[PDB]
Ligand binder design. Structure first.
Ligand SMILES: [Ca+2]
Ligand SMILES: [Ca+2]
Ligand SMILES: [Ca+2]
Length: 126
């Protein structure tokens, strides 16, 4: 049980940018021995691994409220070949940050004629 993430997708057709809102997560796995996590989300639009953004870290919670929005410049015609990755991590002070899980959204599975808001279960990295 890794939890789930609520996100929004909004394609701004005038600017040619995909707006990705990271709203909140719920029921996240605890990646600290004390039974909690310090969650943040790294967001990137595959296959571009260079343009990556990270939310603020939230302290000791498995139900973080993020309220972040990032965007990626991508022509609408190319969008179906992109895969959005929202990778949820647990920030640590004394060791590497820990993967909690990720949500992968093949953009071909979304219709962005109008904006969408959805929940998806976190999965282990492939
Ligand atoms: Ca940890
Ligand atoms: Ca931690
Ligand atoms: Ca760690």
């Amino acid at each position: 049980e890794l939890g789930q993430l609520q996100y929004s997708l909004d394609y701004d057709f005038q600017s040619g940018q995909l707006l990705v809102g990271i709203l909140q997560a719920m029921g996240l796995a605890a990646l600290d021995l004390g039974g909690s996590s310090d969650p943040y989300v790294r967001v990137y639009l595959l296959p571009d691994k260079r343009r990556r953004y990270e939310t603020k870290v939230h302290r000791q919670t498995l139900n973080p409220h993020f309220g972040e929005t990032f965007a990626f410049k991508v022509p609408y015609v190319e969008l179906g070949g992109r895969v959005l990755v929202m990778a949820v991590y647990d920030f640590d002070r004394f060791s590497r940050n820990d993967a909690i899980g990720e949500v992968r959204v093949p953009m071909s599975s979304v219709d962005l004629g109008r904006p969408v808001q959805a929940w998806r279960e976190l999965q282990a990295a492939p």
